[PDB]
Enzyme design. Structure first.
Site, PDB file in Angstrom:
ATOM      1  N   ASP A 147      49.541  48.431  -3.205  1.00  0.00           N
ATOM      2  CA  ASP A 147      49.740  47.287  -2.080  1.00  0.00           C
ATOM      3  C   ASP A 147      50.696  46.416  -2.700  1.00  0.00           C
ATOM      4  O   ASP A 147      50.576  44.896  -2.488  1.00  0.00           O
ATOM      5  CB  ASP A 147      48.200  46.469  -1.550  1.00  0.00           C
ATOM      6  CG  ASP A 147      48.497  45.644  -0.561  1.00  0.00           C
ATOM      7  OD1 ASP A 147      49.463  45.790   0.206  1.00  0.00           O
ATOM      8  OD2 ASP A 147      47.678  44.755  -0.440  1.00  0.00           O
ATOM      9  N   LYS A 163      53.736  43.854  -3.481  1.00  0.00           N
ATOM     10  CA  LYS A 163      54.674  43.163  -2.693  1.00  0.00           C
ATOM     11  C   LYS A 163      54.500  41.829  -3.211  1.00  0.00           C
ATOM     12  O   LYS A 163      53.683  41.352  -4.000  1.00  0.00           O
ATOM     13  CB  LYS A 163      54.259  43.129  -1.124  1.00  0.00           C
ATOM     14  CG  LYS A 163      52.918  42.789  -0.848  1.00  0.00           C
ATOM     15  CD  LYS A 163      52.378  42.533   0.613  1.00  0.00           C
ATOM     16  CE  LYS A 163      50.750  42.419   0.886  1.00  0.00           C
ATOM     17  NZ  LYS A 163      50.558  42.051   2.272  1.00  0.00           N
ATOM     18  N   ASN A 202      51.337  39.529  -3.391  1.00  0.00           N
ATOM     19  CA  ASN A 202      50.339  39.785  -4.058  1.00  0.00           C
ATOM     20  C   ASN A 202      50.443  39.368  -5.736  1.00  0.00           C
ATOM     21  O   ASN A 202      49.744  39.816  -6.372  1.00  0.00           O
ATOM     22  CB  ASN A 202      49.778  41.317  -3.890  1.00  0.00           C
ATOM     23  CG  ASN A 202      49.012  41.744  -2.670  1.00  0.00           C
ATOM     24  OD1 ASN A 202      48.893  40.713  -1.914  1.00  0.00           O
ATOM     25  ND2 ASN A 202      48.922  42.791  -2.385  1.00  0.00           N
ATOM     26  N   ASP A 210      45.407  41.309  -5.817  1.00  0.00           N
ATOM     27  CA  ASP A 210      44.524  41.618  -4.667  1.00  0.00           C
ATOM     28  C   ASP A 210      44.434  43.002  -4.877  1.00  0.00           C
ATOM     29  O   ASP A 210      45.192  43.731  -5.199  1.00  0.00           O
ATOM     30  CB  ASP A 210      45.596  41.216  -3.207  1.00  0.00           C
ATOM     31  CG  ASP A 210      44.240  41.701  -2.125  1.00  0.00           C
ATOM     32  OD1 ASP A 210      43.697  42.703  -2.032  1.00  0.00           O
ATOM     33  OD2 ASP A 210      44.607  40.708  -1.252  1.00  0.00           O
ATOM     34  N   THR A 213      51.785  47.633   3.614  1.00  0.00           N
ATOM     35  CA  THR A 213      52.578  46.630   4.449  1.00  0.00           C
ATOM     36  C   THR A 213      54.074  47.841   4.921  1.00  0.00           C
ATOM     37  O   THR A 213      54.578  48.286   3.862  1.00  0.00           O
ATOM     38  CB  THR A 213      52.798  45.495   4.000  1.00  0.00           C
ATOM     39  OG1 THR A 213      53.436  44.564   5.026  1.00  0.00           O
ATOM     40  CG2 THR A 213      53.976  45.248   2.744  1.00  0.00           C
TER      41      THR A 213
END
Ligand SMILES: Nc1ncnc2c1ncn2[C@@H]1O[C@H](COP(=O)(O)OP(=O)(O)NP(=O)(O)O)[C@@H](O)[C@H]1O
Length: 327
Positions: free
Chosen positions: A151, A153, A156, A169, A186
């Site tokens: 995840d 990005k 985060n 996260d 995402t």
């Protein structure tokens, strides 16, 4: 070398027998609300005995269940109580009561990489490299524990009081040695092998590092469109185009991270993370000095009652006890 085996031992002990109820609500002075999450308030608290400040995340169990975030919430807490690394947010205490789960996090009066990157527009290569180095060391650490992050990005990544990154996260992170199948992340950061839906491994993190480095240096990501389908088509079948201002070294690193074939992707070859650490783009990077947070960060964030104080009300009746047994 010997530190990774020790890091693995410490993680595995905590991973197999997680800590539970390591504090309780009456041990904290409730100062004020810092913000709101998906499941409840984040509150500034003072530990009465130590006088340390923390950010206490309050998760309404009923709301976690209603939004179908049970497994993500338990997974995130199990990982956070087991991991220990300079660029991972620190869970200091956890507990639960009839109504709530409590994640007592280290308080970071920083900024968010997302808002900072969007305000500045794009980072210079030396500044992007500083952040990228931290993510490389973090992925090295997580992968040595068989954790796939999946995840990455800017959203985060928080920028802390010393201008270093902390990954915030872990709902999606999975402990898995080899391959897994779950669709998550995402759209702009999805590795092609996730889209191709025949399974993937920890190499998806090295793809996402490519996307992050491109986005930091360009101010926009390499694959975007008005609709998620067109993004997926560019990721699997298309080519990236580098801005003219990208250095030759950055373009070469990104060609080897934004490699559609995970079998040729840097981080995933015989030499592992060393193909990234020894890349010409990282020639100026002192990897130990980054790890020891001895490098001067290029950006330092410029850090009484609530407008309307709301008390915490904990029910006299246990809510969702079975769902959160392991918390
Ligand atoms: N460790 C922390 N230290 C200080 N403030 C924090 C901390 N964690 C969260 N906050 C504050 O609380 C707000 C909301 O909490 P946050 O953890 O961001 O929500 P979430 O449920 O994780 N989802 P999201 O808002 O998308 O990040 C943040 O925007 C900060 O203002």
């Amino acid at each position: 070398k010997e530190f990774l085996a020790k890091a693995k031992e410490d993680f595995l002990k905590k991973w197999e027998t997680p800590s539970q109820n390591t504090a309780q609500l009456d041990q904290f002075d409730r100062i004020k609300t810092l913000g709101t999450g998906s499941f409840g308030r984040v509150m500034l608290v003072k530990h009465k005995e130590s006088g340390n400040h923390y950010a206490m995340k309050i998760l309404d169990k009923q709301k976690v269940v209603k939004l179908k975030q049970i497994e993500h919430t338990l997974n995130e807490k199990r990982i956070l109580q087991a991991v220990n690394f300079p660029f991972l947010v620190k869970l200091e205490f956890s507990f639960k009561d009839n109504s709530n789960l409590y994640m007592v996090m280290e308080y970071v009066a920083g900024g968010e990489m997302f808002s900072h990157l969007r305000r500045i527009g794009r980072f210079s290569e030396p500044h992007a490299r500083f952040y990228a180095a931290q993510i490389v060391l973090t992925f090295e650490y997580l992968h040595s524990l068989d954790l796939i992050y999946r995840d990455l990005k800017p959203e985060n990544l928080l920028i802390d009081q010393q201008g270093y990154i902390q990954v915030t996260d872990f709902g999606f992170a999975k402990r898995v040695k080899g391959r897994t199948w779950t669709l998550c992340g995402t759209p702009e950061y999805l590795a092609p092998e996730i889209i191709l839906s025949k399974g993937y491994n920890k190499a998806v993190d090295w793809w996402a590092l490519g996307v992050l480095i491109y986005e930091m240096a360009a101010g926009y990501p390499p694959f975007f469109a008005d609709q998620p389908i067109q993004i997926y088509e560019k990721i699997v079948s298309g080519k990236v185009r580098f801005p003219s201002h990208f250095s030759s070294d950055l373009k070469d690193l990104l060609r080897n991270l934004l490699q559609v074939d995970l079998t040729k992707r840097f981080g995933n070859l015989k030499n592992g993370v060393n193909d990234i650490k020894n890349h010409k783009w990282f020639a100026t990077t002192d990897w130990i000095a980054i790890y020891q947070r001895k490098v001067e960060a290029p950006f330092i964030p410029k850090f009484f009652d609530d407008y309307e104080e709301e008390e915490i009300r904990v029910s006299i009746n246990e809510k969702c006890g079975k769902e959160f047994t392991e918390f």
